[PDB]
């Protein structure tokens, strides 16, 4: 079943944000948050 549904998407983003946040890539972190807070 190619094309992971929100189930995987959301989850992935969540973790990514945490890491990308306190990992040095804070730039993407900020934007990332906005994204998750605007899926539709």
Swiss-Prot record:
Q: What does the induction field say? A: The scaffolding protein negatively regulates its own synthesis when it is not assembled into proheads.
Quaternary structure annotation from Swiss-Prot or TrEMBL: Homodimer. Homotetramer. Interacts with the portal protein; this interaction initiates procapsid assembly, thereby ensuring incorporation of only one portal ring per capsid. Interacts (via C-terminus) with the capsid protein; this interaction allow to form the procapsid, in which the scaffolding protein forms an internal shell in the icosahedrally arranged capsid protein subunits.
**Which stretch of the full-length chain is present here?**
264 to 303 of 303
The record describes the protein's role as: Required for procapsid assembly. The interior of the prohead is filled with the scaffolding protein. The scaffolding protein is lost from the structure during packaging. Scaffolding protein exit is followed by the expansion of the procapsid into a mature capsid.
Protein name, entry field: Scaffolding protein
Region annotation (Interaction with the capsid protein) ranges:
12-40
